[PDB]
Amino acid sequence: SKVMTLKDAIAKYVHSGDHIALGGFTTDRKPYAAVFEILRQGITDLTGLGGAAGGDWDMLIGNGRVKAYINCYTANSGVTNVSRRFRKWFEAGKLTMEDYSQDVIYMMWHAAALGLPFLPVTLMQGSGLTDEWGISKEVRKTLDKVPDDKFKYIDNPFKPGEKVVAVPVPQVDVAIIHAQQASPDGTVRIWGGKFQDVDIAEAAKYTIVTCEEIISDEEIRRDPTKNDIPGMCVDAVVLAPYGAHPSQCYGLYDYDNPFLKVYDKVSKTQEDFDAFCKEWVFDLKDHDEYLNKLGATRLINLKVVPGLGYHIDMTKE
């Protein structure tokens, strides 16, 4: 099967240099257990599109693991308005970064899953998003894994006098996503919206799926309608309960707000930040240790209430 530990999997399919893509949307279904092992493994010089990025890309950036970052939005939405390590390193001039509108980013990934030569869109024009390059042609040329051109204005072949913005389709080496159920053969079930998750698991050369639970192949096929990705597109399946913590995970648990608040203040300085990372990331041997550190009841009180879809304290109802 494709069942392997989160240490083994990350080591085998993820490498410095890689153009990665992380699933989930801000504080909803982010692959945290995994982002921990990437850091814990000294993996570095990664490039990638952020998408609706949260604490995940913040941790990588702050830990100086990003060579170039393609950006549309970065905030632990609700808790942190604008990720701190992120805006600090960019403000410091210590991070190579490009800005695209979010629409274009989700498209780029989609066009990749599709197989398009490139992506023509009638978006970003007349905006500073075309009038300004984050990564100059000069710097782009010396970078491995980054297009030489941010975009190119081209004529619309069927609408003369009209031009569109052509955008390079990204080549994703590894895709890391978190789902509720998966089989040993890689069949993946993601309840609720998928965000860019299915696109990046189709596009990426290598795909790692962290899941809350693993069910037999016979079982996951009993109702083909619930499956979102065929085994073929998946290389590593890792059992990681609450692997999205502190972010939501539809039908299972709600975001851990106290935790996200700690991180919000902690990340206001590199010192507080590094201190935080040493305790939660570097000092822990594996994900189990993370769960135990958190404690039983703490996880239980994050569970979703059927009917509501989120967590409400029913004893006060």
Binding site: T26, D103, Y106, H110, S127, Y250, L308, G309
Partner: protein, 260 residues
């Protein structure tokens, strides 16, 4: 839930008074979401809220904190992929459905509603760095917008530091020449001191109405460029039955509306 309304409630109510019935409304969280929730509940029951992460026809119970929250996800009509959402705003323009209204925010704005929410200073070496564009750019390229802004003189600049969301660009004819859809643009600006509009024929900003707690001069004094305040009328305080609603039904936990 009485007659001591907050400035945010004044805004959230004024927002809600602009949502006609049956129209589609793109919002995030924050004040526009409150306002949408209030119109949805009283002023315009069959308007439809949609969010940039692809969550279609929303009706939250507890207010969401981010536009991808389960607070939205578990209480919507259709959970679509992000791409279909962008596909949606564009097609609305192509279909000429003319029923969509959208909310965007920002750090600076100019006479023609061009907004900046990417950075303050040089974009390459900025004084202050925000999240960036998000879906704001798609929204302002293909939708009629309502802009949420702080009424500080340093935010109402004659020229902004970066145009992440394109307004009327430079006046009449500006948008189309840059290759932007010409019949979709900034409709109204809602700040903490009132509502501003854009001339139909010159596209330049003018004061439309000021809150009870403000006046045209207050407005002029906190605007970096000249305005035609001489046409503004005073809005009326929020109907107390509504303030009760906002406090008890809409946001009891005071996530976006804090009581005095």
């Amino acid at each position: 839930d009485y007659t001591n309304y907050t400035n945010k409630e004044m805004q959230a109510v004024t927002i809600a008074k602009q949502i006609k019935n049956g129209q589609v409304v793109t919002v995030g969280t924050g004040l526009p979401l409150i306002g949408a929730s209030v119109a949805k509940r009283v002023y315009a029951p069959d308007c439809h809220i949609i969010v940039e992460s692809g969550l279609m026809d929303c009706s939250p119970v507890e207010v969401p904190r981010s536009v991808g929250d389960l607070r939205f996800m578990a209480h919507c009509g259709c959970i679509w992929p992000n791409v279909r959402f962008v596909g949606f705003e564009i097609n609305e323009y192509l279909h000429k459905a003319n029923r969509l209204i959208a909310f965007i925010g920002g750090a600076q704005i100019d006479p023609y509603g061009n907004v900046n929410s990417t950075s303050i200073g040089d974009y390459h070496h900025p004084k202050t760095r925000f999240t960036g564009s998000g879906g704001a750019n798609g929204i302002a390229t293909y939708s009629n917008t309502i802009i949420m802004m702080q009424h500080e003189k340093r935010r109402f600049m004659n020229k902004i530091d970066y145009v992440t969301s394109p307004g009327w660009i430079d006046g009449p004819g500006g948008r189309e020449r840059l290759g932007l859809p010409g019949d979709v643009g900034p409709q109204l600006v809602v700040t903490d001191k009132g509502i501003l509009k854009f001339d139909e024929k010159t596209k330049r900003m003018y004061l439309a109405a000021y809150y009870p707690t403000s006046s045209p001069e207050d407005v002029l004094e906190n605007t970096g460029f000249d305005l035609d305040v001489s046409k503004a009328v005073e809005l009326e305080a929020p109907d107390p039955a509504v303030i009760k609603l906002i406090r008890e039904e809409i946001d009891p936990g005071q996530a976006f509306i804090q009581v005095p």
